[PDB]
Amino acid sequence: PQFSLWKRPVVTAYIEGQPVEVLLDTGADDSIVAGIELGNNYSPKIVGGIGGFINTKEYKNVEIEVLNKKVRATIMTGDTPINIFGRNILTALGMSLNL
Amino acid sequence: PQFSLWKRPVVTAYIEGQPVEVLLDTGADDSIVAGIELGNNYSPKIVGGIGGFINTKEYKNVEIEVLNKKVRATIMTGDTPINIFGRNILTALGMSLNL
Ligand SMILES: CC(C)[C@H](NC(=O)c1ccc2ccccc2n1)C(=O)N[C@@H](Cc1ccccc1)[C@H](O)CN1CC[C@@H](SCc2cccnc2)C[C@H]1C(=O)NC(C)(C)C
């Protein structure tokens, strides 16, 4: 798969079986999703960007199906305006930025 | 060129001849740089990030030289911890996200 960047590179991912629409984001160091309940086993963390920071819950070894692949990665849940799949996941998938 | 996403995809760009280090950001709709003065023909813009909104100065038709290409694009200026090149520039450069 190749994504021109005219539109936002958004895809459907399933996180612990729940479909979510996510942004493939090379500028994001971490992955953060909203509207999913991941349970009790997390660590309270913070994540920031333009405009400041937000509280998050960090989950490890989360099952993810996306772009026809199956991976386990660290995902944060928090009040993000858009769901993000950052470098942690992109790397696991073998995705690259090319010119 | 190809960028594996193990490290942040950061390159040197010259903005109206001035060198700056920029992050190639598929998740960003706009481009925002700090610490270059681009002059007085700007219009103020409010831009939203993961943690909040910031005030920016938007400049149009800025000459950019990056990855051996020359483009003219819109650039905002404001307090960003990291200089970012978003989809507006990535598109004009002809970059893609591939898997
Ligand atoms: C998701 C985060 C883990 C991620 N941040 C980082 O990876 C990160 C790295 C180093 C840092 C150093 C100091 C302080 C913060 C740092 N944050 C991030 O926000 N990345 C940004 C770019 C970035 C990198 C570094 C620092 C700051 C910002 C993302 O790619 C682009 N981002 C994706 C989330 C949307 S949410 C914004 C919004 C509001 C309402 C509705 N819809 C959208 C906004 C958009 C963005 O920042 N876009 C620009 C740059 C155009 C403002």
UniProtKB/Swiss-Prot annotation, chains A, B:
Residue span, Peptidase A2 domain: 20-89
Signal peptide per UniProt: none
Active site: D25 (for protease activity)
Chain segments carrying region Dimerization of protease: 1-5, 49-55, 88-99
Purpose: Aspartyl protease that mediates proteolytic cleavages of Gag and Gag-Pol polyproteins during or shortly after the release of the virion from the plasma membrane. Cleavages take place as an ordered, step-wise cascade to yield mature proteins. This process is called maturation. Displays maximal activity during the budding process just prior to particle release from the cell. Also cleaves Nef and Vif, probably concomitantly with viral structural proteins on maturation of virus particles. Hydrolyzes host EIF4GI and PABP1 in order to shut off the capped cellular mRNA translation.
Quaternary assembly: Homodimer, whose active site consists of two apposed aspartic acid residues.
Record's protein name: Protease
Lineage: Viruses, Riboviria, Pararnavirae, Artverviricota, Revtraviricetes
Gene expressing this chain: gag-pol
